[PDB]
């Protein structure tokens, strides 16, 4: 899932300075078999 | 920034924990003649002695009588030690030798003198039997001379009795604590609103030192609270007791830097005055009164001393440097950190206004459409960025549509403090043919057409353009805009523009911040121009190309030039304001000269702060394994600059077949400078000359 | 994920994922510096051959002298950044802030700057800056970094020839 | 004498450095584009947007050139010229196992692979070929083929009225037939705003299975107090040089010199003799120009006079380069100037030896890139231009997003192992030669 | 590797499509306040909505609602000198937290024309190019 | 030639030492490719895959990168990457490749001066 943000900031002596931010995020985490294995690889990292 | 740079320069100058620690690792005042007593029989006391020789800026302490034969029974003594406190022919010198074993009945005769002064024989005759280490109360409260412990103060202590009387380098942590407890506590009397009291204060700027009441009247007030606590740190002198001193300055820089985020710019220049004059209380009054109360009366091998004279004079030039750095760092980088250079955005709008800087027209009879795209935004301007006087356009003789009875005489009386900057054609003055004061919001919307009916163009062999000024109140700065149309005879037009942002401060009726530093920088151009006369007028002549006095004379020629364009800007800005505020909605005349002169003061105090930091890495040879890096680079340089002679002989010929065949310094700096960035083999011949000298220098160490 | 479970019930409100997506930047900055400091500790183990110990002894006996010149390099380097920020800082995009006046000095070293805006922003002091920067960086301050690690590597290798031809 | 009787080297040399840029005014650069602004940047109308640098098809090439040449018909001279190449029908072969695809085949615009080919309307020399004895011609070798100087110059009038009238014939009796191989023109402007002599050669090529890929050609040649006063002294201080340095053969090691830092003077003296000999047939050409302003009805023949002029003004700049190093051969007066000449002269034996080993690696990557990338990438089109694009890699200048797209595997195996070997090995070895040589000169003089 | 082609095509829709069919300015080249209005009706509405629900590129999905927030500065927020008080009437200040507008203005009907605090809205700070906004 | 054997003896007696540093070069080089792929790999076209994060490091060495997308993709760690890459590659890791084949060529040539004196 992507989360968008679109800044437009107006300075004094007003022009326009635009800015953006697009970021995907995995937030549903135990679905396939490969993300079971990534869950099994996080705890092994915690052991080391 | 003003509150922060003076908070850090006073903390970076605690690199005198490095200079004083090297002085800590150690710890004609005596005639070299023979001393012998031939009077006292049966009174040889196998003990020590102590000389009491105080005088003209010297307090020579005692001695420690090391005995080979241990000053055996029925004998005397003669020796010589290195007294590190020098008194001349002053009438105060004595001695005191204890009563160890049995009591001595010796009438200690004398000590003869040959080089007492510089080779001068004053006959010393003590010849008096003393008490238990009594002294000579002679020439050359009972003991009311006591009070010559004038170095039991923090004020000007580089001198101590030897091998005893502790806090040598600990006394330079009574400085860092004392300095920042005036910097913190003075920032609290200035705006720290809190909930305090009963008409304590609200803002309290009140004409900072322009009248001499308040900013010095707080100076004798904020000393009273730290010395209630900073005298408790000369109680530790009988560890982590020392560590709370470094803790107390560690919180006094965070509290001070937190409150002084919002000072008005007059409340910062008062904070310097009310802390430098508060410093001066505890230097000149309080330490001079601390020296009375303490211990009122209790009558209820030969070259190492020359090394220290180098290390005083190195520490004296650090007190000059870290204050002369602090003036230059506060002049240029002081105001222009929030107002000045955070807002080039002021410059950035007017470039993207005027619809992308008139799109670079460069045509004669164009820009009459574009004149209906500068006049239409900038005569009503309902968005922002207000007007500040009407604009115009000047023209450079040949007046057309003559009717020369009483008009026809666009004057532009050129009286002004210089000539305006150059372009491709000439160096233009103020005084063109100024007609066309475009105003009244609709005739200026119709004198675009009235300058088409009556032709006012194409004569006098060149021509000219407009000038506009404006400011925004949000940031505290202005703008001077000159658009320029050169009309060459060959081309259609040459069109280039200039937008100059600046801060309009003129005097504040007597005191400001850049009026303060540009008097302090004027003192160092009198301090150094005298110090280069104690070498050139008496110490040596034929001073030719020695870059000691050839480059310390340039640092006078650049410090004095910085303060004479900053007072030139502050004296050009009040005369230009006053003839504006007379006829305020009337004319155009004002602010291109203040703007051009203000950047020649900002860009010239930056080259001063340049040279002050190159000097700070030159002053890095005082670690011995790093001292190769300077010597191997001041030795290769007379020859590696000589390699670049022949590279000019070839690299110009490397252009004389490259830019000579452009059909088959302006061009040359784009042929020399723009060549050494891409082609890079001619950059690495200097690798030999350094490693040849770096090995020959490392092999010498 | 106690924010997303509040939104998966109500499909008509605004989902606040701004506090959740800020810590995805921080997790990708920390877990990428950590991966960088894993491949550097491979240098502790690599150290197998005779010709691999010579290249580790070189870089470890040099870094006392090499750090000493990296302080003298930056004081010249941060003094040109003082000059360009005060002179070019109102006209040129590439010298807009002091943080970005430093980054554009390293671009000069790589090339990457046409400076037709530099000589246009200032006519005289513009190329006095540019020529005396390319002169001091590429003829003096770069060739000195070479001369340090050249005489250090030539002193490691001659030291081991007093370790082989003395124990032969 | 090292300063008195050798003063002819350094004192007269500042005359040649000044009078080169002193005589070369802006008319060969500024007016060279101030004549090139109209016959190259102006399309036909608002209907056609692709100008003569974007033309492909046959009559679409007739939409390219026909408008701007009518404005060209300053004030030029001569007449128009519309020529081409004529190729045979059955000049090449095809297979008779699938012969219902082919009808005829031929070769590119060559010497013997072409033909004459008159067809149909033989009322003039337009659709009827001829030899090169009428006009002037030579074999010209662009990026397509080495051509022939023959054909048939189908001229028009000096006005654009008959240039429009012959353009009505350009539909039927066209410049493009079934063997259309080239298309060329010729012009020369007698400009009033710069009283100078001009040239033109505007060619749109034709390869088979497609259209064109054009090429421009012209150069400026200005006609001429210190106006022409740089003529005697540029030969006179060379005039005793042809008398002294050729009298040096009687003395110098008994005619047996074998040196480098003094033979570069006598080699460039022969490169001075590239100028001194030429002005007896070519630079003294009046009869090439005296026919030009006289008769208006004739066409211009000074465009072929420009062909020997390109190596007149480019070969004359060869005396700029070696005369400065031979100055610095005499110019190393200081002690620190002799050290920098002894370095570069004792090195060049060893440095030439590695410049052969550099090019064999360098001309082996040019073999690889030409055979792999030579069908997909513009920058690797010919072997002459595969070499030039290797030097661009060294400067930067290549995005290689076309390189990894042309070949997926062997593309970046080429690119990484080229940057590895050039910048870590083959550049650092050039440094190591002249570093140990300069460090051996300087230690030799410390033993002096 | 399936991440990059998703956050690239989202950056093509909102940052590269022009604000209108006749103009050229992107979101990356906004130059005036009037250009911001021709964006948020021109290409936001063609970029979120693909005619139920709204599947962007026929395979994405718009989650709920977007919203527009706004930071504002008080009127009496700078001191102008006494000499040019006549022509300049009222000013504004650069964004600081001490110079922020909170009083409701204009058509005070809805939740847009009334200030909320940074806690009543479930939000947090963000670090822009000029300043750091609450 | 005699001057052709000196240039083959140089490159053949060096490649033992020169291969040893080419392993230490790539471990620093493949550790910046780890960092840029994880940080810039979602925003920038030039850092899209790990195979193409390596190819764009060699572009830095030639120039060829404007990095106005790099400082825009990440504000802080972006130029910490870029300055400490140009610092370590051009002041340390390139000058060490020179110093290996400089002391090797200066040891071949001094060895043959102990051979051209032993002949006479």
Curated annotation (Swiss-Prot), chain A:
Record PTM text: Phosphorylated. Phosphorylation is important for protein function; a mutant that lacks the N-terminal phosphorylation sites cannot complement a zebrafish pkd2-deficient mutant. PKD-mediated phosphorylation at the C-terminus regulates its function in the release of Ca(2+) stores from the endoplasmic reticulum.
Superkingdom of source: Eukaryota
Signal peptide: none
Compartments in which it is found: Cell projection, Cilium membrane; Endoplasmic reticulum membrane; Cell membrane; Basolateral cell membrane
TM region(s), chain numbering: 34-48
Tissue-specificity statement: Detected in fetal and adult kidney. Detected at the thick ascending limb of the loop of Henle, at distal tubules, including the distal convoluted tubule and cortical collecting tubules, with weak staining of the collecting duct. Detected on placenta syncytiotrophoblasts (at protein level). Strongly expressed in ovary, fetal and adult kidney, testis, and small intestine. Not detected in peripheral leukocytes.
The family this protein is said to belong to: Belongs to the polycystin family.
Protein's recorded name: Polycystin-2
Taxonomic lineage of the native organism: Eukaryota, Metazoa, Chordata, Craniata, Vertebrata
Swiss-Prot record, chain B:
Effect after changing residue 370 to S: In PKD1; uncertain significance
Record: glycosylation sites: 382, 404, 459
Outcome (variant: residue 243 to R): In PKD1; likely benign
Transmembrane segments: 1-21, 169-189, 215-235, 243-263, 266-286, 310-330, 516-536, 550-570, 599-619, 642-662, 675-694
Annotated effect of mutating residue 49 to M: In PKD1; uncertain significance
Localization in the cell: Cell membrane; Cell projection, Cilium; Endoplasmic reticulum; Golgi apparatus
PLAT domain location: 29-140
Side Extracellular, residues: 190-214, 264-265, 331-515, 571-598
Modification comment: N-glycosylated.
Cytoplasmic side: 22-168, 537-549, 620-641
Outcome of swapping residue 176 to I: In PKD1; uncertain significance
Family classification: Belongs to the polycystin family.
Disease annotated for this entry: Polycystic kidney disease 1 with or without polycystic liver disease: An autosomal dominant disorder characterized by renal cysts, liver cysts and intracranial aneurysm. Clinical variability is due to differences in the rate of loss of glomerular filtration, the age of reaching end-stage renal disease and the occurrence of hypertension, symptomatic extrarenal cysts, and subarachnoid hemorrhage from intracranial 'berry' aneurysm.
Domain notes: The LDL-receptor class A domain is atypical; the potential calcium-binding site is missing.
Protein name: Polycystin-1
Organism: Homo sapiens (Human)
Lineage summary: Eukaryota, Metazoa, Chordata, Craniata, Vertebrata
Swiss-Prot record, chain E:
Recorded consequence of changing residue 78 to S: Does not affect localization to the cilium. Loss of ion channel function
Disulfides per UniProt: 78-91
Processing after translation: Phosphorylated. Phosphorylation is important for protein function; a mutant that lacks the N-terminal phosphorylation sites cannot complement a zebrafish pkd2-deficient mutant. PKD-mediated phosphorylation at the C-terminus regulates its function in the release of Ca(2+) stores from the endoplasmic reticulum.
Residues that carry a glycan: 52, 75, 109, 122
Entry comment describing in which tissues the protein is expressed: Detected in fetal and adult kidney. Detected at the thick ascending limb of the loop of Henle, at distal tubules, including the distal convoluted tubule and cortical collecting tubules, with weak staining of the collecting duct. Detected on placenta syncytiotrophoblasts (at protein level). Strongly expressed in ovary, fetal and adult kidney, testis, and small intestine. Not detected in peripheral leukocytes.
Subcellular location: Cell projection, Cilium membrane; Endoplasmic reticulum membrane; Cell membrane; Basolateral cell membrane
Similarity section: Belongs to the polycystin family.
Record-given protein name: Polycystin-2
Gene source species: Homo sapiens
Lineage: Eukaryota, Metazoa, Chordata, Craniata, Vertebrata
Residues represented out of the complete protein: 244 to 387 of 968
Curated annotation (Swiss-Prot), chain F:
Positions of short motif Selectivity filter: 62-64
Summary of the tissues where the protein is detected: Detected in fetal and adult kidney. Detected at the thick ascending limb of the loop of Henle, at distal tubules, including the distal convoluted tubule and cortical collecting tubules, with weak staining of the collecting duct. Detected on placenta syncytiotrophoblasts (at protein level). Strongly expressed in ovary, fetal and adult kidney, testis, and small intestine. Not detected in peripheral leukocytes.
Spans within the Extracellular topological domain: 41-52, 68-75
Effect listed in the UniProt record for changing residue 59 to C: Abolishes increased channel activity due to a gain of function mutation. Reduces but do not abolish ion channel function. Abolishes the Ca(2+) permeability and alters its monovalent cation selectivity
Subcellular location field: Cell projection, Cilium membrane; Endoplasmic reticulum membrane; Cell membrane; Basolateral cell membrane
Residues in compartment: Cytoplasmic: 1-18
PTM notes: Phosphorylated. Phosphorylation is important for protein function; a mutant that lacks the N-terminal phosphorylation sites cannot complement a zebrafish pkd2-deficient mutant. PKD-mediated phosphorylation at the C-terminus regulates its function in the release of Ca(2+) stores from the endoplasmic reticulum.
Effect of residue 25 to P: Gain-of-function mutation resulting in increased channel activity. Absence of gain of function. Increased channel activity
Binding annotation for Ca(2+) 1: 62
Domain of life: Eukaryota
Annotated transmembrane regions: 19-40, 76-96
Consequence the record notes for mutating residue 25 to A/I: No effect on channel activation
Intramembrane: 53-67
The name this protein goes by in its record: Polycystin-2
């Amino acid at each position: 899932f992507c989360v968008v943000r679109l800044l437009v900031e107006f300075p004094a002596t007003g022009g326009v300075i635009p800015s953006w931010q697009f970021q995907p995020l995995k937030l549903i985490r135990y679905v396939t078999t490969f993300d079971f294995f990534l869950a099994a690889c996080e705890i092994i990292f915690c052991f080391f | 920034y003003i509150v922060m740079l003076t908070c850090a320069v006073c903390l970076v100058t605690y690199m005198v924990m490095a200079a004083i620690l090297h002085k800590l690792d150690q710890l004609r005042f005596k005639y070299e003649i023979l001393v012998k007593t031939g009077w006292g029989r049966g009174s040889g006391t196998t003990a020590h002695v102590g000389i009491m020789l105080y005088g003209v800026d010297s307090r020579s302490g005692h001695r420690h009588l090391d005995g080979d034969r241990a000053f055996h029974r029925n004998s005397l003594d003669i020796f010589r030690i290195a007294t590190p406190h020098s008194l001349g022919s002053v009438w105060k010198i004595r001695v005191w030798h204890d009563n160890k074993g049995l009591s001595p009945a010796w009438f200690l005769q004398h000590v003869i003198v040959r080089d007492l002064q510089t080779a001068r024989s004053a006959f010393f005759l003590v010849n008096d039997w003393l008490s238990v280490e009594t002294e000579a109360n002679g020439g050359l409260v009972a003991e009311l001379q006591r009070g010559f412990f004038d170095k039991h103060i923090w004020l000007s202590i580089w001198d101590r009795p030897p091998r005893s009387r502790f806090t040598r380098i600990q006394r330079a942590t009574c400085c860092v604590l004392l300095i920042c407890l005036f910097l913190g506590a003075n920032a609290v009397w200035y705006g720290a609103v809190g909930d305090s009291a009963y008409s304590t204060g609200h803002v309290s700027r009140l004409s900072p030192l322009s009248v001499d009441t308040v900013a010095v009247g707080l100076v004798s007030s904020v000393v009273v609270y730290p010395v209630y606590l900073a005298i408790l740190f000369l109680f530790r002198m009988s560890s982590l007791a020392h560590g709370l001193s470094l803790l107390l300055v560690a919180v006094a820089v965070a509290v001070s830097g937190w409150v002084g985020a919002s000072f008005p710019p007059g409340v910062s220049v008062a904070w310097l005055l009310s802390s430098s004059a508060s410093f001066l209380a505890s230097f000149l009054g309080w330490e001079p009164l601390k020296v009375l109360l303490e211990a009122l009366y209790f009558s209820l091998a030969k070259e190492e001393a020359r090394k220290v004279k180098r290390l005083h004079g190195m520490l004296r030039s650090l007190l000059v440097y870290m204050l002369f750095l602090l003036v230059t760092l506060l002049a240029s980088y002081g105001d222009a950190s929030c107002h000045g250079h955070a807002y080039r955005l002021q410059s950035a709008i007017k470039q993207e206004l005027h619809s992308r800087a008139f799109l670079a027209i460069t045509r004669s009879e164009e820009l009459w459409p574009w004149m209906a795209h500068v006049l239409l935004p900038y005569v009503h301007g309902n968005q922002s960025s207000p007007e500040l006087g009407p604009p115009r356009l000047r023209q450079v003789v040949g007046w057309e549509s003559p009717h020369n009875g009483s008009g026809t005489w666009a004057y532009s009386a050129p009286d002004l403090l210089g000539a305006w900057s150059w372009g491709s054609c000439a160096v233009y003055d103020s005084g063109g043919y100024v007609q066309e004061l475009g105003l009244s919001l609709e005739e200026s919307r119709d004198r675009l057409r009235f300058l088409q009916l009556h032709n006012w163009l194409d004569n006098r062999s060149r021509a000219v353009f407009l000038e506009l000024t404006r400011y925004s109140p949000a940031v505290g700065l202005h703008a001077a805009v000159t658009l320029r149309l050169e009309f060459p005879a060959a081309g259609r037009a040459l069109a280039a523009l200039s937008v100059r942002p600046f801060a309009l401060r003129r005097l504040s009726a007597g005191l400001s911040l850049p009026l303060l530093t540009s008097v302090c920088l004027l003192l160092f151009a009198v301090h150094f121009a005298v110090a280069e006369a104690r070498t050139w007028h008496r110490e040596g002549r034929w001073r030719v190309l020695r870059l000691g006095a050839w480059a310390r004379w340039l640092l006078v020629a650049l410090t004095a030039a910085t303060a004479l364009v900053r007072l030139a800007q502050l004296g050009a800005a009040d005369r230009q304001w006053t003839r504006f505020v007379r006829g305020r909605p009337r004319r155009f005349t004002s602010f291109d000269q203040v703007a051009q002169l203000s950047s020649a003061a900002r860009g010239l105090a930056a080259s001063l702060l340049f040279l002050l930091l190159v000097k700070a890495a030159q002053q890095l040879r005082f670690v011995r394994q790093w001292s190769v890096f300077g010597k191997t680079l001041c030795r290769a340089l007379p020859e590696l600059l000589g390699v670049t002679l022949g590279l000019v002989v070839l690299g110009v010929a490397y252009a004389q077949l490259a830019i000579l065949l452009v059909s088959s310094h302006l061009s040359p700096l784009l042929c020399v400078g723009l060549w050494a960035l891409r082609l890079w083999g001619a950059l690495r011949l200097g690798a030999v000359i350094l490693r040849w000298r770096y090995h020959a220098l490392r092999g010498e160490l | 994920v106690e924010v997303l479970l509040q939104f998966l019930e109500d499909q008509n409100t605004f989902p606040n994922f701004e506090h959740l997506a800020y810590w995805q930047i921080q997790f990708n900055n920390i877990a990428a510096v950590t991966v960088f400091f894993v491949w550097i500790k491979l240098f502790k183990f690599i150290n197998f051959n005779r010709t691999m110990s010579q290249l580790s002894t070189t870089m470890s006996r040099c870094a006392k002298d090499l750090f000493g010149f990296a302080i003298m390099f930056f004081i010249i380097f941060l003094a040109y950044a003082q000059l360009a920020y005060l002179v070019f800082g109102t006209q040129v995009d590439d010298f807009s802030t002091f943080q970005e006046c430093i980054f554009t000095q390293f671009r000069i070293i790589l090339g990457d700057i046409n400076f037709a805006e530099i000589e246009e922003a200032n006519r005289v002091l513009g190329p006095i800056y540019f020529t005396t920067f390319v002169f001091f960086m590429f003829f003096i301050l770069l060739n000195m970094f070479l001369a340090i690690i050249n005489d250090t590597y030539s002193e490691v290798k001659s030291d081991l020839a007093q370790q082989k031809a003395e124990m032969e | 004498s090292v300063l008195r009787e050798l003063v002819t080297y350094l004192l007269f040399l500042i005359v040649l450095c000044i009078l080169t840029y002193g005589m070369m005014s802006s008319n060969v650069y500024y007016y060279t584009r101030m004549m090139s602004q109209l016959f190259l940047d102006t399309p036909v109308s608002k209907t056609e947007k692709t100008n003569f640098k974007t033309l492909s098809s046959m009559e679409d090439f007739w939409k390219f050139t026909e408008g701007s040449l009518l404005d060209g018909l300053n004030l030029l001279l001569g007449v128009p010229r519309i020529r081409q190449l004529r190729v045979r029908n059955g000049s090449c072969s095809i297979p008779q196992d699938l012969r219902d695809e082919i009808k005829e085949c031929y070769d590119v615009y060559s010497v013997s692979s072409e033909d004459r080919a008159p067809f149909g309307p033989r009322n003039g020399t337009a659709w009827i070929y001829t030899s090169e004895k009428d006009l002037n011609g030579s074999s010209h070798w662009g990026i397509i083929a080495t051509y022939s100087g023959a054909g048939y110059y189908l001229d028009l009038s000096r006005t654009r009225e008959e240039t429009a009238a012959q353009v009505a014939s350009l539909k039927k009796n066209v410049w493009l037939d079934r063997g259309t191989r080239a298309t060329f023109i010729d012009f020369s402007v007698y400009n009033a705003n710069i009283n100078l002599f001009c040239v033109v050669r505007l060619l749109v090529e034709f390869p088979a299975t497609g259209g064109v890929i054009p090429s421009w050609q012209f150069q400026p040649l200005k006609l001429i107090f210190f106006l022409a006063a740089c003529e005697i002294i540029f030969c006179f201080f060379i005039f005793y040089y042809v008398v002294e340095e050729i009298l040096e053969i009687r003395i110098h090691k008994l005619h047996y010199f074998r040196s480098f830092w003094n033979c570069l003077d006598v080699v460039i003296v022969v490169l001075s003799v590239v100028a001194i000999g030429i002005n007896i047939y070519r630079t003294s050409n009046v009869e090439v120009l005296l026919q030009f302003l006289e008769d208006q009805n004739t066409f211009p023949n000074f465009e072929h006079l420009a062909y020997w002029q390109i190596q007149f003004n480019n070969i004359a700049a060869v005396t700029v380069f070696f005369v400065w190093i031979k100055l610095f051969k005499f110019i190393n007066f200081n002690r620190t100037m002799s050290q920098l000449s002894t370095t570069m002269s004792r090195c060049a034996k060893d440095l030439f030896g590695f410049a052969i080993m550099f090019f064999i690696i360098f001309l082996a990557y040019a073999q690889l890139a030409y055979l792999v990338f030579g069908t997909q990438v513009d920058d690797f089109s010919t072997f002459q231009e595969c070499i030039f694009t290797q030097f661009r890699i060294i400067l930067g200048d290549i995005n290689f997003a076309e390189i990894e797209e042309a070949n997926r595997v062997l593309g970046p195996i080429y690119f990484t192992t080229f940057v590895f070997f050039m910048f870590f090995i083959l550049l650092n070895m050039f440094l190591a030669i002249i570093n140990d040589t300069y460090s051996e000169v300087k230690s030799d003089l410390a033993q002096q | 590797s399936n991440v990059y082609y998703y956050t690239r095509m989202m950056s093509q829709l909102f940052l590269d499509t022009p604000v209108s069919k006749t103009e050229k300015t992107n979101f990356k080249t906004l130059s005036s306040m009037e250009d911001f209005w021709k964006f948020t009706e021109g290409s936001l509405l063609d970029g979120l909505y693909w005619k139920n629900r709204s599947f962007i590129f026929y395979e994405n999905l718009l989650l709920g609602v977007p919203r527009i927030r706004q930071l504002r500065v008080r009127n009496g927020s700078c001191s102008i000198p006494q000499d040019l008080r006549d022509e300049i009437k009222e000013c504004y200040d650069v964004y600081s937290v001490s110079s922020e507008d909170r009083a409701p203005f204009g058509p005070r009907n809805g939740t847009a024309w009334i200030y909320t605090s940074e806690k009543d809205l479930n939000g947090s700070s963000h670090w822009g190019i000029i300043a750091t906004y609450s």
